[PDB]
Amino acid sequence: ALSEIETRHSEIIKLENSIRELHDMFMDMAMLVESQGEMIDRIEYNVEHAVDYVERAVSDTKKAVK
Amino acid sequence: KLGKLQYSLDYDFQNNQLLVGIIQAAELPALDMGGTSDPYVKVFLLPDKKKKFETKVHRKTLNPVFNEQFTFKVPYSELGGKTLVMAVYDFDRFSKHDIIGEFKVPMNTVDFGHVTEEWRDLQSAEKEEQLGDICFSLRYVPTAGKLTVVILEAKNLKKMDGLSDPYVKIHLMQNGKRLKKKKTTIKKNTLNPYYNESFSFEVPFEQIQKVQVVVTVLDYDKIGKNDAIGKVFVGYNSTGAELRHWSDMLANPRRPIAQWHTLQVEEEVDAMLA
Amino acid sequence: KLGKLQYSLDYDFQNNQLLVGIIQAAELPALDMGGTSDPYVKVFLLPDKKKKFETKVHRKTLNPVFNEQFTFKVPYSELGGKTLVMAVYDFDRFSKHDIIGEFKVPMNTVDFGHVTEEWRDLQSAEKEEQLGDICFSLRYVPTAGKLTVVILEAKNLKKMDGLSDPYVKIHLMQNGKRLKKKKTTIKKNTLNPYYNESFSFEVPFEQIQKVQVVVTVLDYDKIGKNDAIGKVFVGYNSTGAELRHWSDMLANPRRPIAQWHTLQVEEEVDAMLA
Amino acid sequence: KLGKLQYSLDYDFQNNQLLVGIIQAAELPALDMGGTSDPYVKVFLLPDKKKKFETKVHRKTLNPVFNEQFTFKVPYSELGGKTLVMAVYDFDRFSKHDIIGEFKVPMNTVDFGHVTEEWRDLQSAEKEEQEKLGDICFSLRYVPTAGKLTVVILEAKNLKKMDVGGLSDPYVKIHLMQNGKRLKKKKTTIKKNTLNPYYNESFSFEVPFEQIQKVQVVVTVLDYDKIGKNDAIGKVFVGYNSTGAELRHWSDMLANPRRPIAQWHTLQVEEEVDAMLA
Amino acid sequence: ARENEMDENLEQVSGIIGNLRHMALDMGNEIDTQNRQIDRIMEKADSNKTRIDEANQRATKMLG
Amino acid sequence: NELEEMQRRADQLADESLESTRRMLQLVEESKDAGIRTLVMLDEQGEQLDRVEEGMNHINQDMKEAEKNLKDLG
Amino acid sequence: GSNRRLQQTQAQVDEVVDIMRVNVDKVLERDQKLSELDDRADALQAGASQFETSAAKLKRKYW
Ligand SMILES: [Ca+2]
Numbered sequence A: 001a002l003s004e005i006e007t008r009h010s011e012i013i014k015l016e017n018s019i020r021e022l023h024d025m026f027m028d029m030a031m032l033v034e035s036q037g038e039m040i041d042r043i044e045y046n047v048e049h050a051v052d053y054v055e056r057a058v059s060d061t062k063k064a065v066k
Numbered sequence B, C: 001k002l003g004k005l006q007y008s009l010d011y012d013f014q015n016n017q018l019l020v021g022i023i024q025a026a027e028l029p030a031l032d033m034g035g036t037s038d039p040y041v042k043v044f045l046l047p048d049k050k051k052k053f054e055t056k057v058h059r060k061t062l063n064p065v066f067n068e069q070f071t072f073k074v075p076y077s078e079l080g081g082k083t084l085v086m087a088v089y090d091f092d093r094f095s096k097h098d099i100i101g102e103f104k105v106p107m108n109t110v111d112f113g114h115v116t117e118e119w120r121d122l123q124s125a126e127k128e129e130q131l132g133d134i135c136f137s138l139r140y141v142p143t144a145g146k147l148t149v150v151i152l153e154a155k156n157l158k159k160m161d162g163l164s165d166p167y168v169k170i171h172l173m174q175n176g177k178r179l180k181k182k183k184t185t186i187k188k189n190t191l192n193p194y195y196n197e198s199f200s201f202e203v204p205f206e207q208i209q210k211v212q213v214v215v216t217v218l219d220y221d222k223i224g225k226n227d228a229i230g231k232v233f234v235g236y237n238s239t240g241a242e243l244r245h246w247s248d249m250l251a252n253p254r255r256p257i258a259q260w261h262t263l264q265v266e267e268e269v270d271a272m273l274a
Numbered sequence D: 001k002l003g004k005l006q007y008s009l010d011y012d013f014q015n016n017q018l019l020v021g022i023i024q025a026a027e028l029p030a031l032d033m034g035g036t037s038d039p040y041v042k043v044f045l046l047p048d049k050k051k052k053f054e055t056k057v058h059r060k061t062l063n064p065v066f067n068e069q070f071t072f073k074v075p076y077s078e079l080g081g082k083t084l085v086m087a088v089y090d091f092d093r094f095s096k097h098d099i100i101g102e103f104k105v106p107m108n109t110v111d112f113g114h115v116t117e118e119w120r121d122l123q124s125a126e127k128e129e130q131e132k133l134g135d136i137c138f139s140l141r142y143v144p145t146a147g148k149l150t151v152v153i154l155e156a157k158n159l160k161k162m163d164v165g166g167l168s169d170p171y172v173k174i175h176l177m178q179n180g181k182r183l184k185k186k187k188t189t190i191k192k193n194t195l196n197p198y199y200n201e202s203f204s205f206e207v208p209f210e211q212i213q214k215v216q217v218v219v220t221v222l223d224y225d226k227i228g229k230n231d232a233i234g235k236v237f238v239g240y241n242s243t244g245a246e247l248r249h250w251s252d253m254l255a256n257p258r259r260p261i262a263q264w265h266t267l268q269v270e271e272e273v274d275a276m277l278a
Numbered sequence E: 001a002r003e004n005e006m007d008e009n010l011e012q013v014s015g016i017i018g019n020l021r022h023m024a025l026d027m028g029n030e031i032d033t034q035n036r037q038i039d040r041i042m043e044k045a046d047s048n049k050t051r052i053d054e055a056n057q058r059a060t061k062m063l064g
Numbered sequence F: 001n002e003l004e005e006m007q008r009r010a011d012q013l014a015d016e017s018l019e020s021t022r023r024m025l026q027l028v029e030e031s032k033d034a035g036i037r038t039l040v041m042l043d044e045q046g047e048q049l050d051r052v053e054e055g056m057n058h059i060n061q062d063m064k065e066a067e068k069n070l071k072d073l074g
Numbered sequence G: 001g002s003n004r005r006l007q008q009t010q011a012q013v014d015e016v017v018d019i020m021r022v023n024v025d026k027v028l029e030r031d032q033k034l035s036e037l038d039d040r041a042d043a044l045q046a047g048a049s050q051f052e053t054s055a056a057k058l059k060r061k062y063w
């Protein structure tokens, strides 16, 4: 029957669309994780510079009571 | 500099007419050779399409005395949207009469209740050029969908109003619609400001070839709409150095491309963004 | 338009706390590019100075499902003077999170006896401008002591609540005191009403430079206090076009002076009349 | 030398069949016995692995005349995705029958409406490097200061069948080798019944930056057999004596400190890999 | 058969989807742990912010 | 009649379903690769976050020492 | 079965859809937390720089 094959076809296309939503969702995932990665890089930079400045200040304060 | 002009202004409510008074101009530039100019003053409504009035010509005087008055048949209600322009010209026998200097008075600022008489410094009549240059870097990452616009600096922007108060506003446009409006800090009193300010935008890799980036450098005015110094646009339908910078940015992902751009007049840019 | 929001509301008398229920929003605008917004809802007491609660963020959905509830430790007696504001925001990665749309529910209108759950259309969150224009004529005769205020017309007033029901009320003020309260007719359903209504007042020539005229354009609300569209003031301590019109009126006796005026916000006008 | 082959081609629309005509081959090499050949021709359809036909054997001739015709039971709609292969084999009584030369005709370019017949010069047959063994992806991260080497076994794919009548029972064992000595033996979990196993399992080792260029990392993919010694599917090695993509990944790991680099690697036969190890 | 190729495709797709299920799970776990980690880091951030601000305050006060 | 067209419709819909399955395979493959890259990125960001946290710890310790020195100066 | 393969595949797919959705929202929250931590980091290094300045002054003054 044409009805059977057509219904099978419809279910198949539905599965395809679901897998498409999953696909776009995974790409979105990778993208967001990437951007977050760059922001994390900036955070790391700020933290490192903060470590440097803290080290300098600590060195000077330690050397002040000498 | 370019000189001063003493003008009178009064409105006659009885006859429904505007009285423009030209008394005398002082401290006028030499302009033409022989040590003096031959001045005469053209006065006209800012929006009138009618013949513009002109005073008599005075031979070889930097401080001419016209003592003439002109009348404009104009309603008091419609005068609010008009401005008055007074232009001082120099007479030349065999050449085109070069204009000495003009200035304009907004009619909405004028108190017609009192008879007005004031000295006002003339302004530079015509400009040959059509703004300034601005350097910035462009960075785009397709996977992340990030568009990084780092406003680096600017140079040779024209003086507004003090000297100037230049700042940069970045407009992310798409399909003729403004999506995000970002602005930079103000560097006070400078014609070559330094910013080095990073900006970021969301641009999906499905729309990267379908976006427009309009960078506009403006000067802040304390009172009134902040006048525009200049503006440029890169991306879709972009031309010349802009299209070059954009195409270079696209060819180079995860990498910043620093470049200079010459600012264009607001009118042509606003027209090309249609 | 801006969309709908399904919200729940209930008060727990046992623990003395207010339960605000955020279920789901429907029919939300596209806002940001890529075809969908990233919505999350901030809910807060109208008068609370406390941190305002916010729901989780949903990625790319015009019809998001939060299913979250917040609690406000607030007495039942003091809740009558508070209002609740629910604001829907859009998430943006590199920009300021533009608000999709908000709406407010007065707590005095809420029946806490039954558990509430309703769909409510969102309203336009922010307005950039601060009302409309109104044209009228001014006539003063010193010998007779007559101040003639002829409300001519109005234009471009903002829609209230139907479209609008605009009308003009003239207040003759002196020394911060309201002396005479005059009002015009109501032109139903219009943003540009035409009146041409003459009014007259008693102003002695000893007090003409010591009087204030406050023209207020209002919209009639069937229930509640009639919201103010705009208002202007001319005379003593008057500024700009108003002072111009008044000074012109004084310079021209036995003669009417027709002029337009831009309406200002009620707060600033009420402040400047101090 | 490039010989020639004269072939015929026609499709029977009535019975849905392909008619392949083997007429004659010309200008054949002086192979087999000196001065003459014995050529037998094998004809088959490339996509399909159906039984291969072969013509009669001709004794001692450089210019053989077959004049034989074959029939292929093939639908006309599916013929669009097929390609005809004609291979001119040689004969050797006591040796392996060396292929003289083959050629292929894409059916998408053939007009079966008119009877086709063409001369085609033979070309040297393509050679496969080995049976598909498989690929394996993992990431490498190295930090010199701490001396920690993190190997995250991500996954594998297209692994060769090992257990009889079944697909595979794959797992990964990583051997840190040096001077022909096996030092550390780390292994992953067993992913049952799959040709594309997923691990995502992190491992760590102690590697000083003074010895980084003198260590070998052997990633070995094996199949689990319930009874008996587990046969090895394949293996690769990075570090010393590494070539191509392996040395590339190692160089990436060195060029990128405090950062992981994910990469794929093509598995090689255990014997040759063990051979490349000094 | 074409239905055979279709079914084979279905099977491969199914298995790959399962793999995507595992990946999604491990991913989720890591994301969670890193979120907790971010919370800890932000707490320490506020603490060190406080200490630095106070130390700089007293330091500027001791001027003289 | 439309019998032939019916048969060819069956074949056509079958083709559409098959190519649809191929599309599925390509899509889940791309999803797979993107997922793996995502995981690796998460690893990098994770180790980075660990080093950042330890950095904050060291900052805390050093600032504690500086605090002690300031209390000594006081 | 033929239909059962489709049903199983569909179920698995929708399941992974759910899981991945949850994960994406989690990465949204993570994005917020990372923005906040970014701001806090910048402010922190700024204040640390200022404290370094003050420490330099006090050192050059009291030593
Ligand atoms: Ca001249």
Ligand SMILES: [Ca+2]
Pocket (backbone or CB within 6 Å): B032, B036, B037, B038, B039, B090, B091, B092
């Ligand atoms: Ca002259």
Ligand SMILES: [Ca+2]
Pocket (backbone or CB within 6 Å): B011, B013, B112, B113, B114, C251
């Ligand atoms: Ca007058």
Ligand SMILES: [Ca+2]
Pocket (backbone or CB within 6 Å): B161, B164, B165, B219, B220, B221, B222
């Ligand atoms: Ca200014």
Ligand SMILES: [Ca+2]
Pocket (backbone or CB within 6 Å): C031, C032, C033, C090, C091, C092, C098
């Ligand atoms: Ca948005």
Ligand SMILES: [Ca+2]
Pocket (backbone or CB within 6 Å): C032, C036, C037, C038, C039, C090, C091, C092
């Ligand atoms: Ca969004």
Ligand SMILES: [Ca+2]
Pocket (backbone or CB within 6 Å): C011, C013, C112, C113, C114
């Ligand atoms: Ca109740």
Ligand SMILES: [Ca+2]
Pocket (backbone or CB within 6 Å): C161, C164, C165, C219, C220, C221, C222
């Ligand atoms: Ca009403």
Ligand SMILES: [Ca+2]
Pocket (backbone or CB within 6 Å): D031, D032, D033, D037, D038, D090, D091, D092
């Ligand atoms: Ca031979």
Ligand SMILES: [Ca+2]
Pocket (backbone or CB within 6 Å): D032, D033, D038, D091, D092, D093
């Ligand atoms: Ca022989």
Ligand SMILES: [Ca+2]
Pocket (backbone or CB within 6 Å): D162, D163, D164, D223, D224, D225, D231
């Ligand atoms: Ca086996």
Ligand SMILES: [Ca+2]
Pocket (backbone or CB within 6 Å): D162, D163, D168, D169, D223, D224, D225, D226
């Ligand atoms: Ca086995």
Ligand SMILES: [Ca+2]
Pocket (backbone or CB within 6 Å): F029
């Ligand atoms: Ca691939």
Ligand SMILES: [Ca+2]
Pocket (backbone or CB within 6 Å): F046, F047, F050
């Ligand atoms: Ca970690």
Ligand SMILES: [Ca+2]
Pocket (backbone or CB within 6 Å): F050, F053
């Ligand atoms: Ca830790």
Ligand SMILES: [Ca+2]
Pocket (backbone or CB within 6 Å): G029, G032
């Ligand atoms: Ca959160």
Ligand SMILES: [Ca+2]
Pocket (backbone or CB within 6 Å): G032, G033, G036
């Ligand atoms: Ca948060």
